[PDB]
Structure formats: structure tokens, C-alpha cells
């Protein structure tokens, strides 16, 4: 089940970077998260994460 699943470590890391810098160019964020391409980083945010 699932596809290209992530890990809590990467989720937390991504969340921190996104909130810290901002949900701007995913290219810049991708540089901080090797292997996690801009598309994957975006998908792992503007599709699931939502800190209300």
C-alpha cells in the first residue's frame, strides 16, 4: 500500500524548513532536502500537511 512513502524524520524536517523559510520556491527547499525533489516536497505539503 502507499507509494514513495516518507518518514517522520523527513516530515518534521520539511515542516520546519517550510515554516521557517516559507512555502516559496520548492527548488530552494529541495536543496535542503536531498533526494526529495521540489515536486515531492510540494506534494508532501500542499497535499497533506496542514497545521491549522
For 13, the grid coordinates are 524536517
14, 35, 36 from 6: Cα distances, Å = 11, 11, 10
Question: What was the experiment behind these coordinates?
Answer: NMR
Shortest CA distance to 23 belongs to which of 14, 31, 12? 14
Cell representation of residue 12: 518534521
C-beta atoms surrounding 44 within 10 Å: 19
16 Cβ contact partners less than 8 Å away, ≥ 6 residues apart: none
- Domains, in order of start, for the chain: 1-52 (1.10.10.60)
DSSP secondary structure, 1-52, as one string: --SS---HHHHHHHHHHHHHH-S--HHHHHHHSTT--HHHHHHTTTTS----
Cα separation, 38 vs 40, whole angstroms: 6
Amino acid at each position: 500500500l502507499g507509494k514513495t512513502r516518507w518518514t517522520r524524520e523527513e516530515d518534521e524536517k520539511l515542516k520546519k524548513l517550510v515554516e521557517q523559510n516559507g512555502t516559496d520556491d520548492w527548488k530552494v527547499i529541495a536543496n535542503y532536502l536531498p533526494n526529495r525533489t521540489d515536486v515531492q516536497c510540494q506534494h508532501r505539503w500542499q497535499k497533506v500537511l496542514n497545521p491549522e
